[PDB]
Design a protein around this ligand. Structure first.
Ligand SMILES: *[C@@H]1O[C@H](CO)[C@@H](O[C@@H]2O[C@H](CO)[C@@H](O)[C@H](O)[C@H]2NC(C)=O)[C@H](O)[C@H]1NC(C)=O
Ligand SMILES: *[C@@H]1O[C@H](CO)[C@@H](O)[C@H](O)[C@H]1NC(C)=O
Ligand SMILES: *[C@@H]1O[C@H](CO)[C@@H](O)[C@H](O)[C@H]1NC(C)=O
Ligand SMILES: *[C@@H]1O[C@H](CO)[C@@H](O)[C@H](O)[C@H]1NC(C)=O
Ligand SMILES: *[C@@H]1O[C@H](CO)[C@@H](O)[C@H](O)[C@H]1NC(C)=O
Ligand SMILES: CC(C)C[C@H](N)C(=O)O
Lengths: 31, 605
């Protein structure tokens, strides 16, 4: 009742878009 | 050999090399250890081209008569070329654009052609990964979505083009692609394949946000996944029922096929595609090592893992093609068993595969009138072991049909697809280095912005250009483009790299550079292939392209669910504006070298 492919996309696109805001603030808080 | 006026005082001068390497500890990046450099190199060369382009090319060129030319051409162009790239980047201390501009300022077209063929190959290559991510999201459910047909409006029967074709074809052509009947009409953006595209590019921007030192740990975790999942897949494939029958089809040669021009062009263009030569990414990766580094041990170790894998994947792929050709042959032959015992009313335990030809003659001798309206299917192997295994038709139609007949079938889908994803992501690591680095030596970005701004910039552009592969006709755009920008562009640049080192730079000067770095001169095997043999084989494979471009008709396959005799292949001709596209995609590149040469010589005049 929701399409299991949108849940797995929402978890995978969620762990990517927070992984870029760690790797951008690390670079800044590193140089 | 041209004397090349002013070759010195442009390159480092063989005693400045011990001094310049101790002052590059803050300007140019480094590798952490030796294993981070080997896993980055052989992860750039494996994957998505061992599964997609190799068995598609292997059936057409003699069934299994594609492994002879392949291997020979490999050992005769591949080795020499890959070894010439690891050593000219380590000495010249520069990327792809900085090496060929220090060997005469006229050969700057090679750095601009290696940048334009890394952008156009990686344009469609990151669309195949977005189709792999769509099949990974559609797992994690036990009735797999490609395992059954949907029903009609009126819930009485299946959909009309799922009943004629397979239910696996009504998940790739109509539920994933939503394909149209021609390339001349395109639909809309197809939003569910847009999300996946975004996903792919985003995941590609997370691992290469700073070039090296982020691509490092990534390479680590992605050079292991792929290698250990293939092994877990080998002991499953050989345990199948119809295996050791598509393996024999891979190794029975058709020696008549070894005397055609088109089977040596497709073998010669696969060596320069499997090995990532003429892309400029292996020169930039070797330009970070120390000067006293054995670049001959690295070139014959990487090449015997690249040759061993392309056979190791091909006996996993053909062990499940032989399993579909036994599932289909035992279902077509069970049709002939059941259609005979229903027309004459026999018990089931009397008609089998051992005496089917015995008893069908007994039925026309008994009732010659009642035997006339019966039909008997004509099917035998080597007709099921030779079918349309066209591009994007093996990982999606052949493997996903065989996975649904194993027990614990959601587990073999996830593993397989994550494996494909890894294989295809690690080859976009070095393909991003072929675009980022020569665009950073061109001085088009102001050199105070960080490295993570240019990368992101490129990504956005390519993602915005990837919209043409999400239309309804977006599979017809990926084939054509693919083939052309993957065949022509490789050969030309590969030949220009072998000529300009041994005849413009100088092979006798180049042997003094190898003796300083690794400790000795190259052997007699490296001397014959550099000067005489491999410049020639390449110069040849280049004439075979124009022999088969002419005397063939540009055809492509069409789905068309209104065409009579539907599930078999229909080939129509391209429109007339496709030469503009072909032209661009396989011209710009080549016309670039002579282009710039002319430009500079003119500036001379
Ligand atoms: C081995 O390869 C040859 C070369 O392609 C095949 O010969 C072709 O067969 C098809 C169908 O019979 C013809 O349309 C072609 O004209 C043939 N080629 C030539 C050059 O005459 C041959 O069929 C292959 N062997 C097997 C067993 O299939
Ligand atoms: C199938 O059912 C739909 C109801 O949604 C109806 O509109 C249509 O006419 C039916 N088709 C036939 C052939 O009866
Ligand atoms: C694509 O799918 C949409 C609905 O998902 C449908 O309206 C459209 O007709 C389909 N395109 C083709 C060419 O069938
Ligand atoms: C099926 O019946 C025929 C005729 O009675 C007989 O000859 C044949 O052996 C039977 N098949 C078996 C027992 O497998
Ligand atoms: C029955 O059909 C076969 C071919 O399937 C033919 O060879 C045979 O002569 C036929 N027998 C009669 C009595 O017509
Ligand atoms: C994207 C490409 C550079 C990948 C390479 N041709 C390979 O299949 O290994």
């Amino acid at each position: 009742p929701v399409s299991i492919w949108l849940i797995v996309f929402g978890v995978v696109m969620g762990v990517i878009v927070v992984g870029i805001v760690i790797l951008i603030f690390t670079g800044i808080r590193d140089r | 050999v041209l004397p090349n006026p002013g070759l010195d005082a442009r390159i480092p001068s063989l005693a400045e090399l011990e001094t310049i390497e101790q002052e590059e500890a803050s300007s140019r990046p480094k590798w952490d250890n030796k294993a981070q450099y080997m896993l980055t190199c052989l992860g750039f060369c494996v994957g998505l081209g061992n599964v997609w382009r190799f068995p598609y090319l292997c059936q057409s060129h003699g069934g299994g008569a594609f492994m002879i030319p392949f291997l020979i051409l490999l050992v005769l162009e591949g080795i020499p070329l890959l070894y010439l790239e690891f050593a000219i980047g380590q000495r010249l201390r520069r990327g792809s654009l900085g090496v060929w501009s220090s060997i005469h300022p006229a050969l700057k077209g090679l750095g601009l052609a290696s940048m334009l063929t890394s952008f156009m190959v990686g344009l469609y290559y990151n669309t195949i990964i977005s189709w792999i991510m769509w099949y990974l999201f559609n797992s994690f459910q036990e009735p797999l979505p490609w395992s059954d047909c949907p029903l009609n409006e009126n819930q009485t029967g299946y959909v009309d083009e799922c009943a004629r074709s397979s239910p696996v074809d009504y998940f790739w052509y109509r539920e994933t692609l939503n394909i149209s009947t021609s390339i001349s009409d395109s639909g809309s953006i197809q939003w569910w394949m847009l999300l996946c595209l975004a996903c792919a590019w985003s995941v590609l921007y997370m691992c290469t946000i700073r070039g090296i030192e982020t691509t490092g740990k990534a390479v680590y975790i992605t050079s292991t996944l792929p290698y250990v999942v293939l092994t877990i897949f080998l002991i499953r494939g050989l345990t199948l029922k119809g295996a050791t029958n598509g393996i024999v089809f891979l190794f029975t040669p058709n020696v008549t096929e070894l005397a055609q021009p088109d089977t040596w062009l497709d073998a010669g263009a696969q060596v320069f595609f499997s090995f990532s030569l003429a892309f400029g990414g292996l020169i930039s990766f070797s330009s970070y090592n120390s000067v006293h580094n054995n670049c001959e041990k690295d070139s014959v170790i990487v090449s015997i893992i690249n040759g061993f894998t392309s056979v190791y994947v091909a006996i996993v792929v053909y062990s499940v093609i032989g399993f579909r050709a036994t599932q289909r042959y035992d279902d077509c032959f069970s049709t002939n068993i059941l259609t005979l015992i229903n027309g004459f009313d026999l018990p089931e335990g009397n008609v089998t595969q051992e005496n089917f030809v015995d008893m069908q003659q007994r039925c026309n001798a008994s009732d010659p009138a009642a035997y006339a309206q019966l039909v008997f299917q004509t099917c035998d192997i080597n007709a099921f072991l030779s079918e349309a295994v066209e591009g994007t038709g093996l990982a999606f139609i052949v493997f996903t049909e065989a996975i649904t007949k194993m027990p614990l079938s959601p587990l073999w889908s996830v593993l397989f697809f994550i494996m494909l994803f890894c294989l295809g992501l690690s080859s976009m690591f070095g393909n991003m280095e072929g675009v980022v680095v020569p665009l950073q030596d061109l001085r088009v970005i102001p050199p105070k912005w960080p490295k993570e701004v240019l990368t992101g910039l490129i990504c956005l552009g390519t993602f915005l250009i990837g919209f043409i592969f999400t239309l309804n006709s977006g599979q017809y755009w990926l084939s054509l483009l693919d083939s052309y920008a993957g065949s022509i562009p490789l050969l030309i640049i590969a030949f220009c790299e072998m000529f300009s080192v041994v005849y413009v730079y100088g092979v006798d000067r180049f042997n003094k550079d190898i003796e300083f770095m690794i400790g000795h001169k190259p052997n007699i095997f490296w001397q014959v292939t550099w000067r005489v043999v491999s410049p020639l084989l390449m110069l040849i494979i280049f004439l075979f392209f124009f022999v088969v471009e002419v005397s063939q008709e540009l055809t492509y396959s069409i789905w068309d669910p209104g065409y009579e005799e539907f599930p078999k292949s229909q080939k129509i001709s391209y429109p007339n504006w496709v030469y503009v596209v072909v032209v661009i995609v396989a011209g710009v590149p080549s016309l670039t070298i002579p282009g710039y040469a002319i430009y500079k010589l003119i500036r001379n005049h």
